[PDB]
Symmetry: D3
């Protein structure tokens, strides 16, 4: 995942950050304090960006040309996933964070399928 | 390009970093000094990574569904471009840096076409 | 611009980031939503910092003693440009982003003139 | 793990980076090419640093006084873990990468035990 | 402090950032403007994080087993110091920034004592 | 130094990093091990870059127009200091690291004079 290549990848990296994004959105609903809202937004932005980065790495480094042919929907799937994260950045609604997680789950399923192949 | 969204994008960002990658490769081909080789390698790795990031942003943030439908080869094009940058990281051959630049030129063409549309 | 040196420089890196700064300020004029204002501020802060960095690099790495001699006002100009960016970080008024862009245009003109000699 | 706090933590973050560190060391033993050795060193340094960061976060943010009371060896264990990672940075011997992984596994075991109580 | 190791360390790095944290909190009390509060919060978050990093480095890299043996309360002290910084991130009260500074001063004293010996 | 502004600055930040640069060069002169030379070069590059950044901040943020009027050679001094750091990046000779330290010491003196003004 470091581009050496090292041969070590795991959608878990993207997933954990996306989980923080949703968890933060849930907390933003229980505290309307201005400064908490600012910190939550700041931090959510950072974790969502990291989640996007991890997915980008899987897309550009892990997945090889043949994978996109075996899974015709893969390109679209990853693109929708990063866009869902961009949407989560601009929202306090936990549903947006969950949508990103749902796409990540689909990518994770394909990831392991290609690993066992 | 910052995901606000700000509406400001330019493949030039990716291109300038990719140009540094090739320039460094050419300089490495002319100075076999150990420490220069180390520094050149370290720095080439950083600039190539930045180039990959910029391309990832165009793909994930700027380009929208309509664009991918109008340009069915766009997904693969950007993917091959970033993969070319990964190959440039692992090489001192300027040809690898040029390959990355050629792909970026193709992405640049498509980018501006979508801007005028 | 990487300090190898690589021999590749372009004021465009600073300009593009400064354009994002102003573009963000313009979007802040149209929407008073709290979370949008927080995100806009956070991201504007980040792009203005990158813009200052790119200018600092031109100043520290690209421009040489002969350049400061030929253009006695260069030091002041670059210093005013980065200070203008600091002012843009602290403002939502597009006029501040415009002022930084104007200074950058002056630096850009001098830059290309030095590429001619 | 982001200090909001968000309530999301997992030693897996540290483990994955540590796994990359060991994997890189194994590759370095089999390929003596100078440029590969340089790139592998650069990247290993980066992943080991990330691994240390993740462990530092668990130690500073996740673990609380009651935990250090229940596990009087915890401070020492995490300190040994990060020191093991520093040792891996300075080594091409996969054994150092494995030692770090051994400590991370012990930290992981304690982490999950605190999730049961 | 860079993990080479270079043999150069100074608690002053953590202190200077902690001083900014407090100074920002002091300023937050004299200006209730929304955008200033947002920027102040964003920046305080960043400086507090850097302060935590510097302390983490002293703990993980500089302090060695003999030091922890000579100062049995050191682990707790550094851990409380970073936790104090996390508390400072979540507060506008200068008292939180002060508490972090006080722990840092304690660490600084111990640091120089181990340097004389 | 964080651009809030926070009112906290100290040339010591630049000095400490520059000290690491020289300390690393001294170590490089004594240990010819290939892997150590690689890691030392990689890390020296990073610390020198941080030193340059700290100096750039004093120049762009701390020093104001009146300061440059009172000390006409300040622009040149800082510029020479950062260029000396770039030279240190490209050298293993401790003398280059010392030259940067000498310039920083000159800047430090002017800095404290402006503080007392
Ligand atoms: Ni990897
Ligand atoms: Ni943008
Ligand atoms: Ni360069
Ligand atoms: Ni967190
Ligand atoms: Ni160090
Ligand atoms: Ni500051």
């Amino acid at each position: 995942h470091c581009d050496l290549p090292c041969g070590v990848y795991d959608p878990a990296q993207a997933r954990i950050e996306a989980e923080s994004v949703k968890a933060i959105q849930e907390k933003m609903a229980a505290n309307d304090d201005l400064h908490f809202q600012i910190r939550a937004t700041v931090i959510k932005e950072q974790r969502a960006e990291l989640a996007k980065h991890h997915l980008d790495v899987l897309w550009s480094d892990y997945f090889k040309p043949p994978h996109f042919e075996s899974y015709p929907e893969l390109h679209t799937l990853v693109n929708e996933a990063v866009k869902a994260l961009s949407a989560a950045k601009a929202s306090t609604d936990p549903a947006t964070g969950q949508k990103a997680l749902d796409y990540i789950a689909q990518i994770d399923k394909i990831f392991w399928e290609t690993k066992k192949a």
